[PDB]
């Protein structure tokens, strides 16, 4: 709510943004117990690993390929 | 999926030669490829240094492109009609079954899919010279 | 300050018109044939100077689908209660306005690249608006 | 299907009010009181050889408001004197307002463009003053507004 | 609301007096006696692409005053002789004055611009002389003047 | 030879339906409802000195659709408001559809080109809106189609 | 967005005052009174092969001021006599001043450069005198000055 | 401010008198009788790099006087014969005088410079003789002279 | 094949924004607002006798940006004052930016090259300022970029 | 003798296909799509004093291909980006192909020579790109070939 | 150091323009007709000094087929 600077700049080194596209979300029926819900939506492999998914696991491979 | 997700069916853009990262070229010989084609099992092949899908065929023999186009039409005609009907009934004056109001469906449908398909090249138009029929 | 400015100058303009109109005789009378001139009287002075100098906003809103055009409404004689015709005072004149806004704070997001940037996607399709799948 | 009455009230020409500078005009002609016309088309069209079509909006909103008065009307003197007053002092603009009875309205700034010819004959003559308008957009004063967000498509 | 009579007296064409050089003209045509028209518009308008509007006054007040007379009227000889007299001596200007009955008036300098065609037929012919005017501003001769300081706004 | 009735039903003007943006237009003028005209000729002809003839097709299908409405009709407000809405937001196109009773039809995209003049008089006025059309090809809605493959020759 | 009037007053050509030597000029032509043009470009540009750009200011401010007068105007005699007076005595310079109505102005020294040709015909002729100016910098006479210290950048 | 008449008399083309050798010329063309133009500019200007300005007078007063005559005019023979007479005897100079009606005049020596082309067609042809003038300074013949000692300044 | 609309929105001249030094320009002329032209060809061609062809790129990107303003516009004073300010202080460069509505854009450094002539007449005058540009490469602001890597061949 | 039709089909401008780099161009101007001109004459002629005639062929086949596009067309961005891409990387050549409907064709290499000027006005603007061609020999695509071995003589 | 330099000077340039624009009245307003001037404001100062002094790279990449 309170801004201490009239103008502020976040200098992100190397990384770049990407535009928002329209698409059809795929569904991968994997077997695991990391969350209770039947279906969840992820936007990057970072979020999947943050949910306890092991690197190289089926869901991780599918996501990184997609 | 990454070579198919963000592809708009309205262009009729088949998967014939689309490159896909991650896959590995098929290593069998000519006879094996012929057998695979006879069984409708698509194969990723490497040609002239690159990798390329082939023939995009489905199990039933119909091209995946046609199936995607049919699903696209089926979904979006319905969505357009429902969106018009809901907006027309949200102000009162809901649609009524009479000759004086039904024909507007022609314009409603000619908007959205039937015209976007023509603009993007998915839908064909013109006069056929062989059969002497119009599209 | 803007509210005080409007409050003072609308009143001053109306009073100045009324005094000039009653200083020649022919003072204003409560009838439908003379009341509507208040629309022009008010659209002169504040309501127009504000638009010219940028204080008052105009145009069509694309988000809410509403217009910002200033509006003025004047009641008719048939709607005035008999008591006011004895008190000789008119009421219920309504005006609307939309105030502009200055810019106070700005936030920026920069980015820097060191190595060769990765090749971008080579999709040439016109980006579709939203997913078709909906029931 | 039965015929429908397009309105509840009746179009009364006397209910049309013209306010030039804050005073009501009186002493109009016989047939037509006022005519409002735009000077230029709203939208232009550019057609290519292949058939591509592109259009550009027009920002010229100037118009002409014809005004017919009997040569015996007193308002002829007011306009004639104001013409010379503006010519000398240099101020020509003045507010213009029109109230429709069962139609559109108008409220903009205007000026006197041309003085009509004067002719004396057996019968009472007529004078058709021409009044310019900064913007010639006829605005509605009806329940319109709830449907403009419905016709929208494409 | 009741209908109002726009005037107390009645517009009498005979009361319109035309004085050319100090003498009253007589022997007019049937329908129209005189017509006065301005040559050019009072105010021009320049419209920009963005919509900005600017105007400039016009200082060309020259006009044409049509004058219809029967070919049997004696005033045809006076004007015809004056035409050649001015052509020889070189003086063409002469005062012109018009008095309105229930309308505007005019008082300026003028000259003969074109002689009308002459035609002989079964019925009495008509001649429509054209008289120039240095200034074609029709001036009032009424109680107007107390309201010109009221219409002023902006 | 006996006279033949050109149709079984009767041409009913009320059966002609005009849909602008998805709503039916109502409150038309007296004589003519709509007029559709092409801007340019379909085929041009180049004639040589020796007599050789060559022709080139025209790809300019833009047209103008006149639309007459009474000044008391409510649709005047809708179009007037949409004019300013498009001017501000920048979207001017909207679907246009016409259904013939015993004639040709039309279904294309269109826009408002010019706003008609407004005149107030003794009787109810009329307004003739002009609506552009991307393509002005009148299409049939009849049993036609089985004979187009017969007239063909050369 | 609404159209804006670019000025409050109206551009009046009669308000443009030309003072040559301390006396007002009168008897101008029909279309254009005066035209002011610079002889040379303000800034020159030198472009190298590699793309380097360098510029140099121009100190030649001499200009030409066209002046149109009717051949019947009395000021033709004044200028003609002054031409020979300067030729004999050797003094050619005299002050020149121009006052704009709703535009820029000018106040510098000038001289007569070329006498216009004279032609006699059916209508009144025109003469376009050319008056030199030591400096042809058009100066403003408005509220300008508070923003010149704002556009500055780089 | 009221419009002013620039002159009392009227510019009459017939009053312009041309005397070549002591005889009046007659049989002029339709549009333009005579045109007088100077060959060179009156004053030259030298502009330095720093901005210093210096001027030098021009002493070349030679000019060209165009003269239009109908090919049926008798004066064509006079000039044609005089051309050969001067060619043989060697005397080419003869006085030239021009009297303005409401403008400047001219009185100097002149000679025939070029004979105009001759063309025969459906309508009567025209010939535009060119007559040189030793000095092309147009002199006034008016009340001018009391103000030339007023404009002087600097 | 059916005609296609080349754009979804409509080309609106008011949407074209010109920023000179950080302020928006206003008060444009009637027909054309701005014109941008390159001084020299992009690529030169050298053709040998035998037919060998070789080309060399051009590194001269200087251009001229015409700018039309009404003589009553206030921006005439700003530019006039800035001209003398730069002449005295010696700083002439200032940023220039142009935003297209449905076309290309421009963003470079520029300077004032020549002041337009001033003419006073019956109607409002026009001034066409010339602004230099360091680089006259019109850049796009659209989805272009995904196809530039497709047209490439050879 | 009877008039003969010079062709069976009709010249359709839409059938003319332009392929620049392997993609079809779209969004052409109104009147003319493309113009192809040779830079130099095909054969030169040397004529001696005695009358001997000798000729030499010209091996300079370079030409210019004008290309008109609406400023709203998307292809303006492609060419603009390719201009800078070629300027940086140094590759300027790209294939060019033209298919005639009922005329000659062309298929050679080309490059962008000059970028057209950009102008913004009331109506949609036009841009005329200039594309060079290595060889400007228009080749036929018809039954021609069986008669070229017949016209031969001497 | 380069990142800190950009971060400081972009902010200083924008603030200096905004303060000068609001010190005369006519402060900036949130509309499409006034926002785009930030493009020129930012292209002045850091984004251009960096290119002139060689710190910021420009041109077309031949390997990835991307522009800088």
Tell me the three state secondary structure of residue K25.
strand
The answer to whether I7 contacts D54, with C-beta atoms less than 8 Å apart, is: yes
DSSP state of C26: -
Burial of J28 (0-12, 13-18, 19+ CB in 10 A): buried
Dist. CA C65–CA C48, nearest whole Å: 24
| Of the candidates D28, D2, D5, the residue with the CA atom closest to the CA atom of residue D15 | D28
Q: What element of type H or E holds D83?
A: helix D75-89
C4 vs J126: CA distance, rounded Å: 52
- G22 CB-near residues (< 8 Å, 6+ apart): G95, H150, H151, H153
Q: Could you tell me the resolution of this structure in angstroms?
A: 3.5
Would you tell me how many other CB atoms lie within 10 Å of the CB of residue B10? 22
The H or E element that residue K8 is part of is helix K2-22
* Substitution target from B5, B19, B67, B71 for chain A, most A beta carbons within 10 A: B5
- The phi, psi pair for J5, rounded to 5°, reads -80, 125
- The strands making up G17-20's β-sheet, listed across from edge to edge, are G23-24, G17-20, G94-99, G106-114, G126-133, G63-70, G32-38, I118-121
| Alpha-helical segments (H) within chain H | 75-89
Report how far residue D139's alpha carbon sits from residue J15's, in angstroms, rounded to the nearest whole number: 47
Please give the DSSP secondary-structure letter assigned to residue G135.
-
CB pairs under 8 A between C and D: 25
Angle among Cα G41, G47, G48 to the nearest 5 degrees reads 155
Query: Virtual CA dihedral for B37, B40, B41, B46, nearest 10 degrees?
Result: 40
- Separation between Cα atoms, residue H149 and residue H145, nearest integer Å: 7
Residue H139: CB atoms within 10 Å: 16
Chains I and K touch (3+ CB pairs under 8 A): yes
DSSP state of J47: E
Would the CB atoms of E54 and I33 count as touching at under 8 Å? Answer: no
Integer Cα distance of G107 and G109 in angstroms: 7
Distance CA G23, CA G96 (A): 10
Query: Shortest CB distance from J28 goes to which of D44, D52, D55?
Result: D52
Determine the Cα–Cα distance for residues B133 and F21; give it in Å rounded to an integer. 32
Backbone angles phi, psi at D135, to 5 degrees: -135, 130
| K17 contacts in chain I (CB < 8 Å) | 22
Nearest CB neighbour to F59, from listed J4, J7, J14? J14
Bridge-based pairing of strands I126-133 and I106-114 is antiparallel
Q: Which residue of C has its CA nearest to A4?
A: C105
Residue (of E78, E68, E63) closest to E34 by Cα position: E68
Q: For residue G99, give the 3-state DSSP assignment.
A: strand
Partner-chain contact C20 E146, CB within 8 Å: no
Integer Cα distance of I17 and I101 in angstroms? 8
Of residues H39, H133, H33, H34, the one with CA closest to residue G115: H39
Element (H, E) at H32: strand H32-38
Min distance J12 CA to chain F CA atoms (Å):
5
Q: Do chains B and A touch (3 or more CB pairs under 8 A)?
A: yes
Which of F61, F115, F122 minimises the CB distance to D13?
A: F122
Tally: H helices and E strands in chain B: 4, 2
Rounded alpha-carbon distances, angstroms, from residue B82 to B75, B76, B105, E135, F107: 11, 10, 11, 71, 21
Q: Which of C122, C123, C126, C128 to mutate to test the interface with I (most CBs of I within 10 A)?
A: C122
D-chain residues near J124 (CB < 8 A): 44, 46, 54-56
Method: cryo-EM
Query: Is the distance from CB of H63 to CB of H38 less than 8 angstroms?
Result: yes
* Burial class of residue E89 (count of CB atoms within 10 Å of its CB; 0-12, 13-18, 19+): exposed
State the distance between the two ends of chain K, measured CA to CA, in whole angstroms. Answer: 21
Helix axes K2-22, K46-53, angle to 10 degrees: 140
For H153, residues 6+ apart whose C-beta sits below 8 A from its C-beta are: G21, G22, G94, G95
Q: Which strands sit side by side in the sheet containing I106-114, from one edge to the other?
A: I23-24, I17-20, I94-99, I106-114, I126-133, I63-70, I32-38, J118-121
Gaps in chain A following residue numbers (C to N > 2.5 A): none
The dihedral sign for the CA sequence H105, H110, H114, H119: positive
CA distances from J131 to E49, E134, J37, J114 (A): 32, 62, 11, 8
Q: Kindly state whether B1 is in contact with chain A, defined as any CB-CB distance less than 8 angstroms.
A: yes
Kindly report the number of other CB atoms within 10 A of residue F16's CB atom. Answer: 17
Q: Number of F:I CB contacts under 8 A?
A: 18
Cβ-count burial H16-53 (b if 16+ within 10 Å, e if not): bebebeeeebeebbeebbbbbebeeebbebebeeeeee
Q: Is C59–G4 a contact, with Cβ atoms under 8 angstroms apart?
A: no
User: Could you tell me if B111 lies within 8 Å of chain D, comparing CB atoms?
Assistant: yes
Residues in chain A: 66
Strands C106-112 and A7-13: parallel
Q: What is the DSSP string of I59-95?
A: ----EEEEEEEETTSTHHHHHHHHHHHHHHH----EE
Q: Please tell me which chains touch K, using 3 or more CB pairs under 8 Å as the contact test.
A: A, C, G, I, J
Q: Do residues I20 and D68 touch, judged by C-beta distance below 8 A?
A: no
- Please say whether the beta carbons of H97 and H16 come within 8 A: no
Cβ neighbours of I11 in D, within 8 Å = 54-57
β-bridge partners, H143: none
Helices B113-120 and B64-89, axial angle in degrees (round to 10) = 140
User: Is C38 within 8 Å of C93 (Cβ atoms)?
Assistant: yes
For residue F140, what is the DSSP state?
P
Helix (H) or strand (E) holding B85: helix B64-89
DSSP code for A48? H
Determine the 3-state secondary structure of I112 from DSSP: strand
Q: Does B13 touch chain C (CB under 8 A)?
A: yes
Nearest chain B CA: its distance from F120 CA (Å): 33
Chains in contact with H, where contact requires at least 3 CB pairs less than 8 Å apart? E, G
* Secondary structure class of H66 (helix, strand, coil): strand
- Which of D40, D41, D53 to probe by mutation at the I interface, max I CB count within 10 Å? D53
Cα-based distances in Å from G16 to C55, G12, G97: 36, 8, 11
Cα distance between residue E10 and residue D87, in whole Å: 33
Q: Which of residues 58-117 of C touch I (CB under 8 A)?
A: none
Cα G28-G34-G39 angle, rounded to 5 deg? 150
The number of angstroms, rounded, from the C-alpha of A18 to the middle of its chain's C-alpha atoms is 13
Nearest partner of H140 among H104, H99, H107, H98, judged by Cα: H104
Task: Please answer yes or no on whether B1 and A26 come within 8 Å at the CB atom.
Answer: yes
Distance from CA of I121 to the nearest CA of K (A): 34
Whether residue H97 contacts residue H24, with contact meaning beta carbons closer than 8 Å, is answered with no
Show which subunits contact D, needing at least 3 CB pairs below 8 angstroms. Answer: B, C, E, F, G, I, J
What are the residues facing G126 on neighbouring strands? G70
- Whole-angstrom Cα distance, residue D63 to residue I7? 30
Tell me which residue of I18, I16, I22, I38 sits closest to I134, measured CA to CA: I38
Alpha-carbon distance of C130 to A24, in angstroms, equals 9
Q: Which of J26, J31, J72 comes nearest D50 by C-beta? A: J26
CA dist list (Å): B46 to B24, B25, B49, C118, H39: 9, 5, 6, 23, 86
Helix, strand, or coil here: G69? strand
Per-residue three-class SS string for C50-119? HHHHCCECCCECCCCCCECCCEEECCCHHHCCHHHHHHCCCCCCEEECCECCECCCEEEEEEECCCCCCC
Tell me whether C21 touches chain D (CB under 8 Å). yes
Q: Is E135 in contact with H8 (Cβ distance < 8 A)?
A: no
Q: Do D52 and I10 count as a contact with CB atoms less than 8 A apart?
A: no
**Residue H44's beta-bridge partner residues?**
H56
From K21, K37, K65, residue closest to I19, measured CB to CB: K37
Backbone breaks in chain I after residues (C–N over 2.5 Å):
none
CB count in 10 Å sphere of residue D146: 9
Is residue J87 within 8 Å of residue I57, measured between CB atoms? Answer: yes
The dihedral sign for the CA sequence K57, K62, K63, K67: positive
Looking at the complex, report in whole angstroms how far the Cα of residue J136 sits from the nearest Cα belonging to chain D.
24
Residue of E62, E87, E90 to mutate, testing the H interface (most H Cβ within 10 Å of its Cβ): E90
For D135, the closest chain G residue by CA position comes to: G3
Strands J43-47 and J53-57: antiparallel
- Min Cα–Cα distance to chain D from F147, Å: 29
CB D53 within 8 A of CB F142: no
Alpha carbon distance H46, F132 (integer Å): 62
Q: Does chain J reach chain H with at least 3 CB pairs under 8 Å?
A: no
**D with C: 3 or more CB pairs under 8 Å?**
yes
């Amino acid at each position: 709510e309170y801004q201490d600077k009239v103008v502020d700049v976040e200098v992100s080194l190397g990384t770049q943004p990407i535009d928002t596209v329209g698409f059809e979300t795929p569904m991968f029926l994997a077997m695991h117990g990391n969350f209770p819900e039947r279906i969840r939506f992820y936007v990057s492999t970072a979020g999947m690993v943050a949910d306890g998914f092991a690197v190289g696991s089926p869901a991780y491979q599918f996501a990184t390929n997609a | 999926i990454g070579a198919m997700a963000a592809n708009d069916p309205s262009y009729g853009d088949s998967l014939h030669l689309k490159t896909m990262p991650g896959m590995v070229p098929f290593a069998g010989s000519d006879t094996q490829r012929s057998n695979a084609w006879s069984r409708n099992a698509n194969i990723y092949r490497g040609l002239y240094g690159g990798g390329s899908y082939i023939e995009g065929k489905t199990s039933s023999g119909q091209y995946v492109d046609v199936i995607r186009f049919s699903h696209w039409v089926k979904f979006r005609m319905e969505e357009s009609v429902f969106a018009y009907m809901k907006r027309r009934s949200d102000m009162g004056l809901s649609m009524k079954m009479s000759d004086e109001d039904l024909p507007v469906l022609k314009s409603v449908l000619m908007n959205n899919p039937i015209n976007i398909g023509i603009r993007n090249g998915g839908i064909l138009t013109g006069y056929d010279t062989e059969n002497k029929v119009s599209y | 300050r803007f509210s005080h400015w409007v409050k003072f100058r609308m009143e001053e303009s109306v009073f100045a018109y009324m005094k000039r109109r009653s200083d020649m005789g022919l003072s204003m009378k409560m009838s439908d044939e003379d009341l509507p001139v208040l629309k022009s009287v008010l659209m002169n002075n504040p309501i127009n100077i504000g638009i010219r100098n940028g204080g008052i906003l105009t145009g069509y809103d694309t988000e809410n689908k509403v217009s910002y055009d200033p509006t003025i409404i004047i009641p008719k004689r048939a709607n005035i209660p008999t008591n006011d015709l004895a008190a000789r005072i008119l009421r219920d004149v309504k005006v609307e306005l939309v105030y502009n806004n200055s810019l106070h704070y700005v936030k920026i997001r920069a980015s820097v690249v060191l190595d060769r940037p990765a090749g971008q996607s080579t999709n040439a399709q016109t980006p579709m608006s939203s997913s078709a799948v909906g029931v | 299907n039965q015929s429908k009455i397009l309105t509840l009230q009746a179009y009364d020409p006397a209910k049309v009010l013209v306010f030039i500078g804050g005073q009501r005009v009186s002493g109009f002609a016989a047939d037509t009181k006022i005519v409002i016309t735009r000077n230029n088309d709203n939208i232009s069209v550019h057609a290519g050889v292949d058939g591509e079509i592109s259009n550009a909006l027009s920002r010229d909103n100037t118009g002409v408001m014809t005004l017919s008065l009997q040569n015996t009307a007193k308002w002829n003197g007011y306009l004639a004197q104001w013409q010379r007053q503006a010519n000398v002092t240099g101020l020509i603009y003045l507010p213009v307002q029109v109230e429709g009875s069962q139609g559109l309205s108008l409220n903009t700034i205007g000026w006197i463009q041309k003085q009509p010819d004067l002719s004396y004959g057996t019968e009472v003559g007529q004078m058709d003053w021409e009044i310019g308008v900064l913007d010639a957009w006829l605005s509605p004063d009806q329940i319109q507004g709830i449907a403009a967000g419905i016709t929208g498509l494409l």
